[PDB]
């Protein structure tokens, strides 16, 4: 019985609403269709570095994220590319908060302070072989949802 | 045994008479089952010679001519100008095959002298000119294949297939 | 035997080549050249087959059936292909050299490893078993070289020392084999220990970094900047074209594969980045 | 003895190899390699039997009756078949290496695990009891390897450390520099504890994105994009060929399997995948 | 212009003399030049007929003969037992090639008739029996290439390439 | 008992048959009818439903076609035969769910009309996936046989 | 005790990122990270390595802050933005060479300050050339990712 | 030229006095090198004759004898009782093939005749009875490979070879 499709539905509700411009939606759809195969081939840690490097984790975008974890009325603002990459980062972190892989207080307390995003990535590193196995179906679900509910350019 | 006359099908109409046993028996190797000609024979290295319409053997690896195989002996006035040779039905470059054959054929072919004084330049002659096609249908297919215009009113298939199967190399010299 | 014909050939890049693998995440470049399991560049036989098949279908309109028989029907295939392509093993690649103490001056040289030679030998052995074919001249030259496996050599030069790709200082020692028909232009041909030659071969490519201009402001768009790997022109890849006993396979190997000299491989065709010459070892060795 | 003849062998991939495993919705590779019961690649003996049977049927057309007897009929089975293929256990996959603590620089190496060896030992132990043939040599080699379980182990080298497939670090121990290498090759063989062996073996596999280009304009087709999975060339699978007492079984084991070296395993043959060499243990060890 | 003749290279003796002329001109398109032979000729659809060794007209493109092409005027008592052709020098099937040709050629082929009462089912033939190699060399490769064993000591090389480069198909008569 | 499901299969098939207008669409739907029930019962109903919707391309045009089809029987599904066949199969499933009282026709027809509600429809499906998988098998097998019998092999 | 190129990159970036007090120096190190890796491919590792050692302008007192960076996590790279960015990237590369045991810290330091040993370092670098370039561009790619991530676009 | 003879290895003691010539030539096909024996010959359809152990032919492919193939000639009072064959070295059923062979051979098989006064049933036999393994090591693999106990102090491996690899058939009588 498959609750990763359920968790995927919740995360997709959140991000689909948190993107105003339609181009941001479509960019997210492309990230969804691509980064799952990437995370399968290359692995989790390389792909994570890729995403977070194309996400523009300032204290503004990270604020929009930290609120998105609870808001239902938050908004991801920025360029289509930055916001698509941050939305996928939220997808991943949202999986990690549920499924108890990362303590939510730790994830928040690290997203706030820059001196702890490195420790976030260090924990992510220690756990990578677990995450890379668990998150596969979650990400395939997000892929299917994206290519269903969003259109193409 | 069993004699197969090979008739070349170019867009040239010197095919008035070349064979008296045009069926003689009942069978052929080419036929139609509602899908176009089957088992079309292809001869490689042989260029057609419409003036004295026959085949002349070029040593070219991809000079060629497609025609059909029908049982029969040519013209009863032969063994002087044609080729004849017996083949085990698997030395045959058969295109659009349908099955097997009795494994022993004596094939006659309209063969000519290569005119060994002038360059043997040839040219890919595809078939077009649906007007040519209609007289070819009339004068070869319905004449030998008395199936056609008798059961399959949908000859459009074999009309297009004639266009989409037959093509040769000719010198035009 | 299993295969009617078996026709090894060499692929000479006239211009530069780009056959793409498409933008991984563990790579630096984002439009890298196809690699093989050992790291060397290669041309997947799917790329080779597609390029050659398209070329043939466009330039031999009279013989589509023949081509369709040997390379495989396109729409509604009813049987397999009588024709096989093998992944194009890299044979030798240009490489930037700084040599001294040598009479003739060279701006570049050909570079191989013993791993690539072992792979070519393996290809030849396999296809000599699976077919009534044996290219004993090529095999004998290859293993004449392979006898020296374990030390850098030069087939035709007096190079003793050199710096390859301004990074790797190698000490060579000649061999008297002088394969003259693949390396026609008298360029030397270094065969290197496989651990030193991997680095040389891999930095021996070209990363030409491109951009996209914002027509409004006429500056480079944001995020519009990338690299691409081309393989130097005059690069030689080795590959084998195999065929199964059929009437069309003879017509193919005699007419088609004898009039087939130049093709366009890969992408960036409109940058002048695809042109290639096929050699047919059948008349090269 | 339940079995007349029992012929273990090794399958060496000459080219890359793709035996397809069927596609599902939750699959993440369009065309995945056949998997074992614990994740490693294998070759289901359905594929071995069909492959080798087709090859034999076309290469030995005079011995058709012997083939049909030992490998069952195609047209009307009025009886079973006297011949039996066991599923090919992956024996040793090749893996990139970067040396530490060593002397001889290797570019790659053979990798195997203790679980694959235990499956091979099960095969051997059962096939010895079910036939007149004992495999004491291979058995003793495998058992003196399996004595060192848990610890990563190199066989013929002195590596003492290495980085496999760019990411995984292993501190090896030399088993014994007098145990003859089971692998006939001169490259070392590492036997790894399995928790790391499976990761190395997963990264050895070759994934490849192909596309389908429209044949009227050099632009892709909608939906024409997929990924594939191959085992590298130079991979070794271990299998067994078993026969029940008969006269045709004697002819089979007598001059079919002594004239049977190269076959074509699996699919993607037009792309030049799946050329395989069989190496009977009766003469390889 | 110049007139070349096709001496095929089977393993059976019809070889020592076919054309009274060895050179006649001063050229041969085939060149044995310190790298092996060059510009060998191949002719498809034809098998050899070692019993009176002569190339026979089949149709199967899998049948072929590989031989050398050297200028000649055959025996001056013919046009009844050969096949003569004049080709534009670019239709020829050449392997092991070296250079381009004289743009138009005359060629004589040891033709024969199929005798359509005995079936031919060719089989592939290589050159074995290393004593046959030596006599093959001496029968022709000396009368034509006299330079052999005079200015060259790469004669084992010609033996190797003559064993490897010359297969053919036989009639099974 | 599930004997009703053959009447249901017949009428739904008549729908999605006379909807797909080009014959390539029909043969594509035939391939879908064959393989998708196998996938449903090998992988699960939810994975296969996600797979279907992802390949159906639910835009406004396609979804009004589906709704009118629920009602009219004069509708016609257009748009890239692969997508039109995956949407025909989506309609087969939704038609069962409606005509058998699992999803309410009102809730569903609402959900195909608005975008906040497609997600809630998918969530509602997920919550009843055991029941749908259990009850839809006979219906789907009948549809598969009907396609094999009435649509010509490709 | 063996750290992978990404774990090594993370451990190095930690110390560098801490030691760059001024934010301009960080933003300059980000651009260094983005371009020096493509330059290291295009021109080889030894040329670019000494390019970095010269663009750093080690100053014989900033060299000492760099030297302390290996030991004390309370070091601070001082100097102009363009100098400190290059000395930070130099620390990155030296760290890879050391933590991988390719070269020794003692030799690297001596060759870095004393000039007689600089040429011995050139020699030792040409000897170990295939050892370095094999797996350093992965470490520098990780560093480039981490930089573009944790540092703001100027 | 190339003259060999087949010393079969049963547990029958009819072994050493079978051949004049212990080496004579050089190319012993059965080798022993660091991994055990190599190129063991295997004759199918022939079983042993324990009373004067010799190869009597049955028509049964299920019967065989595995032994070594060494250059020589039998005892000079023979060949009225042997099978002398000239084979192209590729018909030979060799086990544990190591190198390649001289393309033509002469093999001397200890032959008998059925003497059809009694049904010639057979039995599979292995090699055991350690005294047999020891005197087959010494009285055979020293009379030929005397380098054993000189260079191969690893006779453990070769006795394991003998125990495992030489199984044969007997006549039950």
CB contacts, 8 Å: G96 with chain D: none
Closest chain G residue by Cα to residue C197: G130
Cα(B120)–Cα(A146) distance, integer angstroms:
65
Q: Which of D135, D196, D136, D147 is nearest to D176 (CA)?
A: D147
Backbone angles phi, psi at F14, to 5 degrees: -60, -40
Residue D68 CB neighbours (<10 A)? 17
Technique behind the model: cryo-EM
Instruction: Quote the Cα angle for B36-B38-B42, to 5°.
Output: 120
D136–H34: do the CB atoms touch at under 8 Å?
Answer: no
Cα(G6)–Cα(A137) distance, integer angstroms:
25
Q: Which of C155, C169, C156 is nearest to C99 (CA)?
A: C169
**Contacting residues for H160 by C-beta, under 8 A, at least 6 apart:** D136, D137, H36
CA distances from A140 to A8, A9, F35, F72 (A): 9, 12, 20, 36
Q: Is there a contact between A34 and A81 (Cβ–Cβ < 8 Å)?
A: no
Tally of residues, chain B: 173
Residue E126 CB neighbours (<10 A)? 12
Q: Which of F106, F101, F107 is nearest to F120 (CA)?
A: F107
C-alpha dihedral over D46, D51, D57, D60, to 10 degrees?
-130
Is H154 in the D-facing interface, judged by CB distances under 8 Å?
Answer: no
Q: Is there a contact between H1 and H41 (Cβ–Cβ < 8 Å)?
A: no
DSSP category for residue A22: H
CA distances from B162 to A50, B94, B129, C57, D168 (A): 59, 16, 11, 21, 65
Cα(D176)–Cα(D234) distance, integer angstroms:
24
- Torsion F3-F8-F11-F12 (CA) sign: negative
The subunits that touch chain H, with at least 3 C-beta pairs less than 8 Å apart, are D
| Beta bridge partners of residue B55, listed in sequence order | B48, B111
Q: Which residue has the tokens 């249901």?
A: F8
Burial environment of residue C232 by CB neighbours within 10 A (0 to 12, 13 to 18, 19 or more): middle
CB burial readout E49-63, b (16+ within 10 A) else e: bbeebbbbbbbbbbb
Burial environment of residue D1 by CB neighbours within 10 A (0 to 12, 13 to 18, 19 or more): middle
Q: How many helices (H) and strands (E) does chain F have?
A: 9, 0
If DSSP codes are grouped into helix, strand and coil, which group holds residue F140? helix
Q: Which residue has the tokens 């509910």?
A: A149
DSSP category for residue C256: I
Is D23 in the A-facing interface, judged by CB distances under 8 Å?
Answer: no
Cα(C110)–Cα(C231) distance, integer angstroms:
13
Backbone angles phi, psi at B135, to 5 degrees: -70, -30
D169–G2: do the CB atoms touch at under 8 Å?
Answer: yes
Residue F113 CB neighbours (<10 A)? 13
CA distances from C209 to D140, D254, E85 (A): 58, 62, 58
List the structure tokens of D51: 């492959």
**Contacting residues for F90 by C-beta, under 8 A, at least 6 apart:** F52, F53, F56, F58, F66
**Contacting residues for D279 by C-beta, under 8 A, at least 6 apart:** D9, D10, D11, D12, D184, D261
Cα(C85)–Cα(H150) distance, integer angstroms:
53
Q: What is the resolution of this structure in A?
A: 3.1
| E strand map for chain E | 3-8, 40-44, 46-47, 56-57, 64-71, 83-87, 94-95, 105-109, 123-125, 168-170
> CB under 8 Å, gap of 24 or more: what pairs does D41-44 form?
D41/D90, D41/D93, D41/D201, D41/D205, D41/D231, D41/D235, D42/D87, D42/D88, D42/D89, D42/D90, D42/D237, D43/D11, D43/D19, D43/D87, D43/D88, D43/D237, D43/D239, D43/D265, D43/D266, D44/D19, D44/D87
Question: Strand E105-109 and strand E3-8: pairing?
Answer: parallel
Residue F102 CB neighbours (<10 A)? 17
**Contacting residues for G22 by C-beta, under 8 A, at least 6 apart:** G81, G84
Q: Which of D105, G129, G118 is nearest to C170 (CA)?
A: G129
- Report the Cα–Cα distance between both ends of chain D, in Å, rounded: 23
Q: Which residue has the tokens 């290291």?
A: G40
List the structure tokens of E163: 């064993």
**Contacting residues for E29 by C-beta, under 8 A, at least 6 apart:** E4, E39, E69, E70, E94, E101, E102
If DSSP codes are grouped into helix, strand and coil, which group holds residue E67? strand
How many independent structural domains does chain F possess?
A: 1
Element (H, E) at G7: helix G5-19
Cα(D83)–Cα(D65) distance, integer angstroms:
13
**Contacting residues for C103 by C-beta, under 8 A, at least 6 apart:** C158
Q: Which of E168, E171, E167, E169 is nearest to E121 (CA)?
A: E171
Q: Which of A80, G135, G38, G44 is nearest to C226 (CA)?
A: G38
C62–B167: do the CB atoms touch at under 8 Å?
Answer: yes
CB contacts, 8 Å: B107 with chain E: 59
Distance from CA of residue F4 to its chain's centroid?
18
Domain housing F90: 3-150
Cα(C163)–Cα(C99) distance, integer angstroms:
7
Residue C70, CA atoms < 13 Å, CB-side half-sphere = 32
Is B2 in the E-facing interface, judged by CB distances under 8 Å?
Answer: no
Cα(G125)–Cα(B78) distance, integer angstroms:
88
**Contacting residues for D17 by C-beta, under 8 A, at least 6 apart:** D230, D231, D233, D235, D265, D266, D273, D274, D276
F43–D25: do the CB atoms touch at under 8 Å?
Answer: yes
Backbone angles phi, psi at G144, to 5 degrees: -65, -40
Q: Is there a contact between A61 and A33 (Cβ–Cβ < 8 Å)?
A: no
Cα(H135)–Cα(F104) distance, integer angstroms:
92
**Contacting residues for C130 by C-beta, under 8 A, at least 6 apart:** C1, C2, C3, C6, C242, D262, D275
Burial environment of residue H91 by CB neighbours within 10 A (0 to 12, 13 to 18, 19 or more): exposed
Q: Is there a contact between D203 and D209 (Cβ–Cβ < 8 Å)?
A: no
Q: Is C279 left (phi over 0), alpha (psi -120 to 50) or beta?
A: alpha
D207: nearest CB among A36, A41, A140:
A41
Residue C166, CA atoms < 13 Å, CB-side half-sphere = 11
G146–A54: do the CB atoms touch at under 8 Å?
Answer: no
List the structure tokens of H107: 């093999």
Cα(G65)–Cα(G58) distance, integer angstroms:
10
List the structure tokens of A65: 């994220």
Tally of residues, chain H: 173
If DSSP codes are grouped into helix, strand and coil, which group holds residue C44? coil
Instruction: Quote the Cα angle for B60-C51-C68, to 5°.
Output: 55
Distance to chain B for E14, nearest Cα, Å: 22
User: DSSP characters for F23-87?
Assistant: HHHHHHHHHHHHHHHHHHHHH-HHHHHHHHHHHH---HHHHHHHHHHHH-S-----S-HHHHHHH
Q: Is there a contact between E53 and E13 (Cβ–Cβ < 8 Å)?
A: yes
DSSP category for residue H147: T
Element (H, E) at G65: helix G62-69
Element (H, E) at C190: strand C189-192
A–C contact: 3+ Cβ pairs < 8 A: yes
D25–F82: do the CB atoms touch at under 8 Å?
Answer: no
The subunits that touch chain D, with at least 3 C-beta pairs less than 8 Å apart, are A, C, F, G, H
Cα(D274)–Cα(D51) distance, integer angstroms:
10
C167–G46: do the CB atoms touch at under 8 Å?
Answer: yes
- Torsion G15-G18-G19-G24 (CA) sign: positive
Question: Strand C189-192 and strand C153-154: pairing?
Answer: antiparallel
Helix H, strand E, coil C: the string for E123-148 is: EEECCCCHHHHHHHHHHHHCCCCCCC
Cα(D18)–Cα(D31) distance, integer angstroms:
9
G–E contact: 3+ Cβ pairs < 8 A: no
C166–G45: do the CB atoms touch at under 8 Å?
Answer: no
User: DSSP characters for C125-178?
Assistant: HHHHHTBT---HHHHHHHHHHHTTTTS-EESSS---EEEETTTEEEE--B-S--
| Radius of gyration, alpha carbons of chain E | 15
Residue D284, CA atoms < 13 Å, CB-side half-sphere = 21
If DSSP codes are grouped into helix, strand and coil, which group holds residue C69? helix
Backbone angles phi, psi at B100, to 5 degrees: -115, 170
Helix H, strand E, coil C: the string for chain D is: CCECEEEEEEEEECCCECCECCCCCCCCCCECECECCCCCEEECHHHHHHHHHHHHHHHCCCCHHHHHHHCCCCCCCCCCCCEEECCEEEEEEEEEEEECCCCCCCCEEEEEEHHHHHHHHHHHHHHHHCECCCCHHHHHHHHHHHCCCCCCEECCCCCCCEEECCCEEECCCECCCCCCCCCCCCCCEEEECHHHHHHHHHHHCEEEEEEEECCCCCCEEEEEEEEEEEECCCCEEEEEEEECCCHHHHHHHHHCCCCCCEEECCCCHHHCCCEEEEEEHHHHC
CA distances from G40 to G5, G136, G143 (A): 17, 10, 14
Q: Is there a contact between E51 and E115 (Cβ–Cβ < 8 Å)?
A: no
Q: Which of B9, E140, F36 is nearest to E158 (CA)?
A: E140
Q: Is there a contact between D82 and D70 (Cβ–Cβ < 8 Å)?
A: yes
Burial environment of residue H133 by CB neighbours within 10 A (0 to 12, 13 to 18, 19 or more): middle
CATH code at A49? 1.10.520.30
Cα(C281)–Cα(C138) distance, integer angstroms:
9
CA distances from D117 to A66, D92, H85 (A): 50, 10, 45
E96–C283: do the CB atoms touch at under 8 Å?
Answer: yes
Cα(H160)–Cα(A61) distance, integer angstroms:
74
DSSP category for residue H156: H
Burial environment of residue D205 by CB neighbours within 10 A (0 to 12, 13 to 18, 19 or more): buried
**Contacting residues for H53 by C-beta, under 8 A, at least 6 apart:** H8, H10, H12, H13, H14, H110
DSSP category for residue E50: S
D98: nearest CB among G4, G101, G134:
G134
User: DSSP characters for chain B?
Assistant: --EEEEEE--S----SSS-S-SSSSS-BSSEESSS-EESEEEEESEEE-STT-SEEE---TT-EEEEEEEE---SSS-SSSSEEEEE-SSSS-EES--S---S-EEEEE-B----TTS----EEEE---HHHHHHHIIIIIHHH-TTTTTS-S-THHHHHHHHTT-EEEE---
Cα(D24)–Cα(D8) distance, integer angstroms:
33
Residue C212 CB neighbours (<10 A)? 12
Q: Is there a contact between D42 and D90 (Cβ–Cβ < 8 Å)?
A: yes
- Torsion A62-A67-A70-A75 (CA) sign: negative
Q: Is there a contact between H124 and H72 (Cβ–Cβ < 8 Å)?
A: no
């Amino acid at each position: 019985y498959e609750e990763d499709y359920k968790l995927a539905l919740e995360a997709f509700k959140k991000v689909f609403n948190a993107l105003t411009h339609y181009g941001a939606k479509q960019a997210f759809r492309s990230r969804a269709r691509d980064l799952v195969e990437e995370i399968y081939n290359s692995g989790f840690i390389p792909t994570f570095f890729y995403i977070i490097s194309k996400a523009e984790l300032n204290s503004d975008s990270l604020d929009s994220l930290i609120s998105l974890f609870s808001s239902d009325n938050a908004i991801l603002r920025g360029s289509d590319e930055n916001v698509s990459y941050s939305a996928y980062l939220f997808i991943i972190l949202y999986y990690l908060i549920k499924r108890g892989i990362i303590e939510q207080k730790f994830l928040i307390q690290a997203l706030r302070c820059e001196k702890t995003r490195l420790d976030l990535i260090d924990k992510l590193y220690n756990l990578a072989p677990i995450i890379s196995a668990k998150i596969r179906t979650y990400l395939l679900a997000i892929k299917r949802l994206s290519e269903a509910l969003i259109e193409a350019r | 045994s069993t004699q197969r006359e090979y008739v070349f099908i170019p867009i040239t109409n010197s095919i008035t008479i070349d064979v008296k046993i045009t069926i003689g028996g009942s069978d052929h190797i080419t036929n139609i089952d509602e899908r176009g000609i089957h088992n079309v024979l292809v001869i490689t290295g042989y260029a057609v010679d419409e003036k004295n319409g026959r085949l002349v053997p070029t040593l070219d690896p991809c000079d060629y001519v497609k025609g059909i195989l029908v049982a029969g002996t040519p013209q009863q006035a032969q063994s002087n100008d044609f080729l004849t040779l017996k083949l085990p039905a698997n030395k045959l470059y058969l295109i659009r095959k349908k099955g097997n054959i009795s494994d022993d054929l004596k094939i006659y072919i309209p063969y000519s002298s290569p005119d060994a004084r002038n360059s043997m330049k040839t040219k890919p002659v595809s078939i077009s000119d649906d007007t040519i096609v209609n007289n070819i249908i009339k004068e070869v297919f319905d004449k030998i294949y008395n199936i056609t215009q008798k059961e399959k009113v949908k000859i459009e298939k074999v009309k297009e297939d004639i266009k989409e199967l037959f093509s040769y190399y000719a010198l035009e010299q | 035997p299993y295969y009617a014909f078996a026709e090894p050939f060499f692929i000479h890049a006239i211009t530069h080549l780009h056959v793409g693998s498409g933008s991984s995440v563990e790579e630096e470049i984002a439009l890298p050249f196809q690699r093989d399991e050992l790291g060397y560049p290669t041309i997947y036989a799917s790329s080779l087959k597609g390029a050659i098949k398209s070329f043939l279908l466009k330039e031999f309109p009279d013989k589509r059936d023949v081509i369709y028989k040997v390379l495989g029907e396109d729409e509604n295939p009813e049987e397999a292909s009588l024709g096989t392509f093998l992944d194009a093993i890299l044979f030798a690649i240009p490489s930037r050299i700084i040599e001294i103490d040598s009479a003739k001056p060279y701006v570049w040289v050909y570079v191989t490893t013993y791993e690539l030679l072992k792979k070519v030998k393996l290809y030849l052995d396999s296809i000599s078993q699976l077919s009534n074919a044996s290219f004993s001249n090529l095999k004998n030259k290859i293993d004449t070289i392979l006898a020296k496996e374990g030390k850098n050599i030069t087939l035709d030069s007096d190079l003793k020392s050199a710096i390859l790709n301004e990074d790797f200082y190698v000490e060579l020692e000649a061999l008297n084999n002088k394969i003259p028909s693949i390396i026609n232009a008298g360029v030397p041909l270094l065969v290197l220990e496989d651990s030193i030659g991997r680095e040389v071969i891999n930095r021996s490519l070209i990363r030409v970094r491109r951009i996209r201009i914002d027509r409004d402001k006429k500056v480079v768009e944001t995020g519009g900047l990338w690299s691409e790997e081309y393989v130097p022109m005059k690069t030689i890849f080795f590959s084998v074209l195999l065929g199964k006993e059929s009437k069309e396979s003879a017509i193919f190997a005699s007419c088609i594969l004898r009039n087939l000299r130049y093709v366009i491989l890969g992408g960036k065709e409109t940058i002048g980045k695809g042109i290639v010459e096929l050699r047919w070892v059948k008349d090269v060795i």
